[PDB]
Ligand binder design. Structure first.
Ligand SMILES: *[C@@H]1O[C@H](CO)[C@@H](O[C@@H]2O[C@H](CO)[C@@H](O[C@@H]3O[C@H](CO[C@H]4O[C@H](CO[C@H]5O[C@H](CO)[C@@H](O)[C@H](O)[C@@H]5O[C@H]5O[C@H](CO)[C@@H](O)[C@H](O)[C@@H]5O)[C@@H](O)[C@H](O[C@H]5O[C@H](CO)[C@@H](O)[C@H](O)[C@@H]5O[C@H]5O[C@H](CO)[C@@H](O)[C@H](O)[C@@H]5O)[C@@H]4O)[C@@H](O)[C@H](O[C@H]4O[C@H](CO)[C@@H](O)[C@H](O)[C@@H]4O[C@H]4O[C@H](CO)[C@@H](O)[C@H](O)[C@@H]4O[C@H]4O[C@H](CO)[C@@H](O)[C@H](O)[C@@H]4O)[C@@H]3O)[C@H](O)[C@H]2NC(C)=O)[C@H](O)[C@H]1NC(C)=O
Ligand SMILES: *[C@@H]1O[C@H](CO)[C@@H](O[C@@H]2O[C@H](CO)[C@@H](O[C@@H]3O[C@H](CO[C@H]4O[C@H](CO)[C@@H](O)[C@H](O)[C@@H]4O)[C@@H](O)[C@H](O[C@H]4O[C@H](CO)[C@@H](O)[C@H](O)[C@@H]4O)[C@@H]3O)[C@H](O)[C@H]2NC(C)=O)[C@H](O)[C@H]1NC(C)=O
Ligand SMILES: *[C@@H]1O[C@H](CO)[C@@H](O[C@@H]2O[C@H](CO)[C@@H](O[C@@H]3O[C@H](CO)[C@@H](O)[C@H](O[C@H]4O[C@H](CO)[C@@H](O)[C@H](O)[C@@H]4O)[C@@H]3O)[C@H](O)[C@H]2NC(C)=O)[C@H](O)[C@H]1NC(C)=O
Ligand SMILES: *[C@@H]1O[C@H](CO)[C@@H](O[C@@H]2O[C@H](CO)[C@@H](O[C@@H]3O[C@H](CO)[C@@H](O)[C@H](O)[C@@H]3O)[C@H](O)[C@H]2NC(C)=O)[C@H](O)[C@H]1NC(C)=O
Ligand SMILES: *[C@@H]1O[C@H](CO)[C@@H](O[C@@H]2O[C@H](CO)[C@@H](O)[C@H](O)[C@H]2NC(C)=O)[C@H](O)[C@H]1NC(C)=O
Ligand SMILES: *[C@@H]1O[C@H](CO)[C@@H](O[C@@H]2O[C@H](CO)[C@@H](O)[C@H](O)[C@H]2NC(C)=O)[C@H](O)[C@H]1NC(C)=O
Ligand SMILES: *[C@@H]1O[C@H](CO)[C@@H](O)[C@H](O)[C@H]1NC(C)=O
Ligand SMILES: *[C@@H]1O[C@H](CO)[C@@H](O)[C@H](O)[C@H]1NC(C)=O
Lengths: 392, 245
């Protein structure tokens, strides 16, 4: 009986989950636009993959509360990022990154839904902006004062004038989580059951599409087989994904079942027809509209470099060359103990663009999907703590 | 003999055959600066035809849920025509205005507007919502230009003053059962006899629907509001190169 792995105060599996001892390394990759005016004239874009930007992460758990005689647990999962310099190319507070301007493409979206229409259309007209800007790395990723968003703030005081890709994510949580420990059964261990009081999602089409499955992805339940299907709900992708078996791997000196995120998460299936909002008209295979769960920002979540996606988007951007080894998402799990050995979460943040005649900053741009950034969040178990798990 | 009018000045005339009456703001016509008042010692330019024209500026659509609009004068005309060229070359400026706002509708539509002037219409903000952060309005809310700007809280006119007593200032109503236009002749009101045309905006034209538009479905749902204005007795001074702002 492997009841040793539970979330009980007095166990060493709860100590690993409250405070994760193994560091998490995230490398931020960017896309640099080489011909920015020619995209406004209507030519094919040409980009450049720029990195690596190694951040070392920090993890803990706060507000841990028990209940229902020990089987239900609810806590928050904070996440703080600390940059590492020797594992990165250059100093990020000087490194200028030229890309799209996401706030001025956000507020064009707000004019399309009549959310502050004549206020925003007076901003971009009298204050002429740029579709393509150039800021530093720490500005574009950790908050920067936008021109137009500082003007919406005096009309609407709820809008934050600072935009960032991961703004207010240093030392803050991504929801009030509640889990299910393995005091009742070892099939459902630390499984997400509700989210901020709400049972499941509410913005998708069908009630099958709303269902949150599985865990957050920090550690799984043990006794993993080859034929079962594991389910993962990250808070960034805004649905629950699954993972399929890939091959036989060898982590140091322990068993491993390599599971990878398949193409059928975002494929063109009859199940995934209901994840294109509103009426199932999809932009393509492998992409996902996530504009609801980013407070109105026109963001697309997809694999890096359109991997396992449509080819007519690959030929639209010069520099998209996806392959298996470099731009997938995988996880190494110990099949006997469920401790994640070596994972790599790689997802691309894209910004949708289209030529609209009421905004004369878009030029003559083609309707397409544009590359902005992606990142490899990697976790890894070192030599000493691998030999601690070789005994059990 | 009051419903039908014609306002010709410059080379541009406008006819109206369902007017109310012309009101002259504060009981006096716009006039030139006398030598009792003038302090600048260079001879002013007075174009007298090329800038005293009815400039038709923009067209605001008025639906059933509108709030109200405002135009800061004379910054609606510092981008337009020979007025916008003389006001950018010359530092000093004075003029009156003949302000004519058209809004026609059928004999089944209803609703009333309060097109009113008010001098030195300064704009406040919502002070960060709760009222503790000293936020100043942006340059486009301050001086929107010929595009106009829509009021956020028309009950307080974005300045903490109620619209219920806006009727003190020179105004007249456009209710669609009686009239379709509203002429307001405004003199030059300012302390000092000339001023800059790019910084100081002497007054603002508040156009607010008080009684809302209403019509049964089947009638024409597009009811525009176009304002035309004419600088009367305009004169400029202090010639230098072109500033735009
Ligand atoms: C990812 O994901 C995301 C998420 O989803 C997405 O996003 C998206 O996007 C899209 C695109 O854009 C969108 O859609 C859109 O939308 C829009 C908007 O809507 C909204 O808004 C509105 C407004 O309202 C206003 O107005 C009115 C009157 O009209 C009034 O009454 C009110 O009050 C208001 O007022 C205000 O404002 C104004 C402005 O101007 C001002 O002035 C004043 O002052 C005030 O303030 C609204 O209404 C709406 O609402 C809705 O909803 C609600 C709920 O709550 C309800 O209740 C209601 O009823 C409604 O509903 C209805 O409607 C709608 C429409 O609107 C529909 O859809 C539905 O179904 C129902 O029916 C909202 O909120 C819109 O507009 C649009 O629409 C359009 O389009 C379509 C297609 O596309 C079609 O079908 C339609 O029909 C339309 O069309 C139209 O329009 C155009 C433009 O404008 C034009 O041009 C044309 O021509 C047409 O017109 C025609 O028709 C009409 C009828 O309709 C008539 O009347 C006329 O005359 C003519 O004949 C669209 O839909 C969306 O939204 C979004 N989302 C959300 C959620 O939102 C994205 O996309 C993705 N991505 C990708 C890539 O995909
Ligand atoms: C997180 O994810 C990122 C990517 O998302 C990973 O970074 C990549 O890591 C791989 C492997 O370490 C790197 O691939 C290596 O690239 C070398 C240079 O490649 C360039 O030049 C070749 C021509 O030689 C071009 O074809 C190619 O397009 C590149 O322009 C190769 O020489 C390496 O080859 C080695 O492995 C192959 C594997 O088949 C062997 O055949 C060879 O003999 C050789 O041993 C290798 O392919 C890749 O460059 C990295 N990308 C970036 C942007 O850094 C991170 O490793 C991953 N993890 C972490 C913790 O960040
Ligand atoms: C992404 O692409 C963009 C453009 O495609 C690129 O932006 C440009 O980078 C260069 C190089 O950093 C910038 O040029 C510098 O500008 C400063 C400011 O005036 C100058 O002082 C610099 O002069 C130095 O030039 C030499 C070194 O390059 C030295 O020998 C010399 O003595 C000077 O010290 C230099 O010209 C340029 O300003 C930007 N352009 C914009 C619009 O930002 C960006 O670097 C790319 N990013 C990455 C990560 O590759
Ligand atoms: C969250 O998990 C639930 C349950 O694990 C998922 O619901 C199930 O989704 C599968 C999709 O493969 C449905 O299977 C379907 O079965 C029919 C035959 O019955 C087959 O023809 C289809 O091709 C498909 O395979 C299954 O019916 C469905 N069950 C229920 C009760 O809804 C759900 O999809 C998961 N959601 C997310 C976002 O992960
Ligand atoms: C995110 O917040 C963390 C927490 O303060 C920052 O990490 C520390 O920053 C201080 C600042 O001098 C330094 O001691 C180290 O860089 C970090 N200390 C530890 C113990 O980790 C971090 O800099 C913040 N990062 C961003 C991008 O905002
Ligand atoms: C994704 O799959 C749907 C479902 O088949 C596609 O919609 C059909 O597309 C074909 C053309 O390839 C049309 O002839 C059919 O009339 C469409 N049917 C429906 C119900 O929409 C959709 O085109 C696919 N996506 C892409 C990008 O090809
Ligand atoms: C865990 O340790 C002891 C066990 O009773 C208790 O005093 C302590 O408060 C517990 N910690 C939490 C966070 O509940
Ligand atoms: C998880 O554990 C077992 C196995 O599925 C099941 O009986 C139990 O109801 C599950 N609970 C939840 C919340 O999924």
């Amino acid at each position: 009986i492997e009841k040793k792995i539970v979330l009980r105060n007095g166990t060493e599996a709860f100590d690993s989950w409250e405070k994760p001892p193994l560091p998490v390394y995230t490398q931020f990759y960017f896309f640099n636009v080489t011909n920015p005016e020619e995209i406004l004239r209507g030519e094919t874009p040409r980009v450049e993959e720029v990195g690596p930007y190694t951040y070392r992460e920090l993890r803990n758990k706060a507000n841990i509360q028990f209940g229902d005689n020990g089987t239900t647990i609810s806590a928050v999962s904070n996440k703080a990022y600390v940059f590492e310099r020797d594992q990165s190319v250059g100093d990020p507070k000087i490194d200028l990154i030229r890309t799209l301007n996401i706030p001025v493409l956000t507020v064009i979206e707000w004019s399309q839904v009549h959310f502050l229409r004549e206020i925003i259309e007076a901003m971009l007209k009298a204050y002429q902006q740029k579709l393509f800007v150039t800021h530093t790395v720490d500005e574009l990723l950790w908050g920067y004062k936008d021109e137009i968003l500082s003007l919406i703030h005096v009309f609407r005081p709820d809008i934050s004038p600072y935009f960032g890709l991961f703004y207010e994510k240093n030392g803050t949580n991504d929801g009030d989580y509640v889990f299910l420990t393995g005091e009742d059964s070892y099939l459902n261990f630390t499984k997400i059951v509700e989210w901020n009081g709400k049972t499941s999602l509410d913005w998708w089409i069908t009630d099958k599409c709303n269902m949150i499955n599985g865990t957050d992805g920090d550690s799984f339940h043990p006794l993993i087989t080859k034929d079962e299907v594991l389910y993962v709900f990250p808070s960034d992708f805004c649905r629950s994904v699954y993972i399929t078996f890939s091959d036989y791997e060898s982590v140091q000196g322990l068993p491993a079942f390599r599971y990878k995120v398949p193409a059928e998460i975002l494929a063109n299936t009859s199940d995934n027809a209901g994840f294109c909002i509103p009426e199932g008209n999809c932009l393509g295979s492998g992409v996902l509209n996530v504009s609801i769960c980013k407070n109105g920002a026109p963001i697309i979540m997809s694999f890096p470099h359109f991997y396992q996606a449509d080819e007519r988007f690959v030929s639209a951007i010069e520099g998209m060359h996806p392959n298996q080894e470099d731009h997938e998402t995988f996880v190494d799990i110990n099949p006997l103990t469920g401790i994640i050995l070596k994972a790599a979460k790689r997802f691309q943040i894209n910004i949708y663009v289209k030529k609209l005649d009421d905004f004369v900053e878009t030029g003559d741009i083609r309707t397409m999907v544009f590359p902005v950034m992606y990142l490899n969040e990697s976790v890894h178990i070192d030599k000493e703590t691998a030999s601690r798990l070789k005994s059990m | 003999s009051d419903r039908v009018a014609q306002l010709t000045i410059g080379n541009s005339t406008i006819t109206t055959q369902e007017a109310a009456n012309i009101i002259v703001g504060y009981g006096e016509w716009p006039s030139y600066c006398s030598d009792d008042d003038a302090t600048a010692v260079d001879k002013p330019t007075r174009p007298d035809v090329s800038v005293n024209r009815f400039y038709t500026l923009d067209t605001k659509l008025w639906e059933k849920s509108s709030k109200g609009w405002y135009w800061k004068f004379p910054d609606v005309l510092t981008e337009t025509g020979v007025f916008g060229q003389n006001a950018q070359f010359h530092y000093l400026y004075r003029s009156g205005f003949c302000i004519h706002v058209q809004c026609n509708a059928s004999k089944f539509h209803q609703g009333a507007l309060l097109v009113a002037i008010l001098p030195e219409y300064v704009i406040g903000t919502v002070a960060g919502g709760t009222g503790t952060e000293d936020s100043h309005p942006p340059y486009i809310q301050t001086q929107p230009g010929a595009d106009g700007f829509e009021l956020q809280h028309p009950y307080v006119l974005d300045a903490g003053i109620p619209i219920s007593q806006l009727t003190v200032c020179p105004h007249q109503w456009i209710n669609l059962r009686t009239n379709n236009c509203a002429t307001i002749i405004v003199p030059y009101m300012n302390t000092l006899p000339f001023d800059s045309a790019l910084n100081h905006c002497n007054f603002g034209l508040l156009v607010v629907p008080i009684s809302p538009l209403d019509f049964d479905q089947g009638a024409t749902p597009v009811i525009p509001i176009t304002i035309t204005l004419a600088p009367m007795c305009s004169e400029f001074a202090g010639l230098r190169q072109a500033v735009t702002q």
